[PDB]
């Protein structure tokens, strides 16, 4: 019960900057006023 959409137009991928976002809490531990 799937449909094949051959109409997709394929082109080389675009690119952009990421800046500095993408940081996540490494562990489920509370830390305060500290460089880790």
């Amino acid at each position: 019960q799937c449909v094949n959409l051959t109409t997709r137009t394929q082109l080389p991928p675009a690119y952009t900057n990421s800046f500095t976002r993408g940081v996540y809490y490494p562990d489920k531990v509370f830390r305060s006023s500290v460089l880790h």
Binding site: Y25, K28, V29, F30, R31, S32, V34
Partner: protein
């Protein structure tokens, strides 16, 4: 309870691979039929303090006390000291906080979820 149903074939630690590839098949069935006695062995692997605790022992809980020197055991996180109120507003995900040199300084206890300061 056990005496050609088992087979055996480096590999990574804890890895798992069930594959097959002088035409030889890499599988090798054992001739199940006292040094050759088959053993049904099990291994229990644990990951301590990598997450909030999920399984524990049959030890019963106890009511908590503040401003008192006590020997406490917080979900296996043993210690000694005083439990006080703290303005350390934990985000709803993390359980217990740590000071430098990796020591437990704050904890949220079961059955109340309040942020106690050790």
């Amino acid at each position: 309870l056990d005496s050609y149903n088992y087979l055996y074939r480096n590999l990574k630690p804890f890895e798992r691979d069930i594959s097959t590839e002088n035409c030889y098949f890499p599988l090798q069935s054992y001739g199940f039929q006292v040094g050759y006695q088959p053993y049904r062995v099990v291994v229990l692997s644990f990951e301590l303090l990598h997450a909030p605790a999920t399984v524990c022992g049959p030890k019963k809980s106890t009511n908590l006390v503040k401003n008192k020197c006590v020997n406490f055991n917080f979900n296996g996180l043993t210690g000694t000291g005083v439990l006080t109120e703290s303005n350390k507003k934990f985000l709803p995900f993390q359980q217990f906080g740590r000071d430098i040199a990796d020591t437990t300084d704050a904890v949220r206890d079961p059955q109340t979820l309040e942020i106690l300061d050790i």
